[PDB]
Amino acid sequence: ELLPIELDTLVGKGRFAEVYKAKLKFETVAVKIFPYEEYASWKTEKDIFSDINLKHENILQFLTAEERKTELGKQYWLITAFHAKGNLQEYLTRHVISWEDLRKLGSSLARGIAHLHSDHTPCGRPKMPIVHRDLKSSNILVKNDLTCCLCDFGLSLRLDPTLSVDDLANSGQVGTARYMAPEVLASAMNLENVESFKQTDVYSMALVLWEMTSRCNAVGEVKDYEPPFGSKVREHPCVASMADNVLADAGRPEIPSFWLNHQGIQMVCETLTECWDHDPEARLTAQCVAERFSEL
């Protein structure tokens, strides 16, 4: 019943699990291992990866889930495709990307998020939208063809109409503080789980598009990679320090005027700027962004 897997190298370590590059006796696969204590996170990701309506080229390919008894107890595994180029944060740290790379990475990221957010399958059938809630460059994988691929669904929320308004309150602010929308940092959301939770994902996507743009040679002179707000906040910033920047100071990652000399870069910058607007209603949808990138 269990797959013939040999773990090779630890390639990732998140809040809930360890990710290993492994040999499947495909040959190279990724194995995400959750201890028994993190069963809930394993189940949450398993439910997304197993959903036939969530199979998409810009969502990490799933092979199978397994329960593996160990001496110390039991581990819960998620076996997926392995992307050798690694996560987007690591990729952008090492590489200066081309305009073509930026277009492919940006468009594929917007397509993946638009698919999660969609209330219908491509064939028109209704489907319950998913909000990622932890969109960031370390949660995006770079495929060999230089397109994006979403992963790390441990904090994702299925926009189920049965969701309690009071239960969503604490819960509290979920995700990574650095990428939290101003309305999340402000504790200013309503139990309108629909367009409102989708808008928080679009804000985080804007910061990621900024990261991709900041490492694109089409801007002219490219600086060393820095995460969003890297020059203003500490390595693991708290919600309070982020609120002081994003909300109180209306701070956003810098877009030097010289970036706008390239027509394509100018279009990407105008788009991501609309997506990180203070007002969630002024933001474009992920589908709008996917359309703007196809126009490029």
UniProtKB/Swiss-Prot annotation:
Highest taxon of the lineage: Eukaryota
Known EC number: 2.7.11.30
Residues with the Phosphoserine modification: 164
Effect on the protein upon substituting residue 292 to C: In LDS2; has a negative effect on TGF-beta signaling
Cytoplasmic side: 1-296
Cofactor(s) demanded: Mg(2+); Mn(2+)
Region of interest called Sufficient for interaction with CLU, as start-end residue ranges on this chain: 194-296
Membrane topology: Single-pass type I membrane protein
Keywords for the protein's UniProt record, in alphabetical order: Aortic aneurysm, Apoptosis, ATP-binding, Cell membrane, Craniosynostosis, Differentiation, Disease variant, Disulfide bond, Glycoprotein, Growth regulation, Hereditary nonpolyposis colorectal cancer, Kinase, Magnesium, Manganese, Membrane, Metal-binding, Nucleotide-binding, Phosphoprotein, Receptor, Secreted, Serine/threonine-protein kinase, Signal, Transferase, Transmembrane, Transmembrane helix
Main subcellular location: membrane
Top-level EC class: transferase
Effect listed in the UniProt record for changing residue 281 to Q: In esophageal cancer
Active site feature: 134
Compartments, record wording: Cell membrane; Membrane raft
Domain Protein kinase positions: 5-296
Molecular function GO terms recorded: activin binding; activin receptor activity, type I; ATP binding; glycosaminoglycan binding; kinase activator activity; metal ion binding; molecular adaptor activity; protein serine/threonine kinase activity
Catalysed reaction, written as an equation: L-threonyl-[receptor-protein] + ATP = O-phospho-L-threonyl-[receptor-protein] + ADP + H(+); L-seryl-[receptor-protein] + ATP = O-phospho-L-seryl-[receptor-protein] + ADP + H(+)
Disease linked to the protein: Hereditary non-polyposis colorectal cancer 6: An autosomal dominant disease associated with marked increase in cancer susceptibility. It is characterized by a familial predisposition to early-onset colorectal carcinoma (CRC) and extra-colonic tumors of the gastrointestinal, urological and female reproductive tracts. HNPCC is reported to be the most common form of inherited colorectal cancer in the Western world. Clinically, HNPCC is often divided into two subgroups.
Assembly information from the UniProt record: Homodimer. Heterohexamer; TGFB1, TGFB2 and TGFB3 homodimeric ligands assemble a functional receptor composed of two TGFBR1 and TGFBR2 heterodimers to form a ligand-receptor heterohexamer. The respective affinity of TGFRB1 and TGFRB2 for the ligands may modulate the kinetics of assembly of the receptor and may explain the different biological activities of TGFB1, TGFB2 and TGFB3. Component of a complex composed of TSC22D1 (via N-terminus), TGFBR1 and TGFBR2; the interaction between TSC22D1 and TGFBR1 is inhibited by SMAD7 and promoted by TGFB1. Interacts with DAXX. Interacts with DYNLT4.
Function: Transmembrane serine/threonine kinase forming with the TGF-beta type I serine/threonine kinase receptor, TGFBR1, the non-promiscuous receptor for the TGF-beta cytokines TGFB1, TGFB2 and TGFB3. Transduces the TGFB1, TGFB2 and TGFB3 signal from the cell surface to the cytoplasm and thus regulates a plethora of physiological and pathological processes including cell cycle arrest in epithelial and hematopoietic cells, control of mesenchymal cell proliferation and differentiation, wound healing, extracellular matrix production, immunosuppression and carcinogenesis.
Protein name (database record): TGF-beta receptor type-2
Annotated source species: Homo sapiens (Human)
Origin organism lineage: Eukaryota, Metazoa, Chordata, Craniata, Vertebrata
Gene name linked to the record: TGFBR2
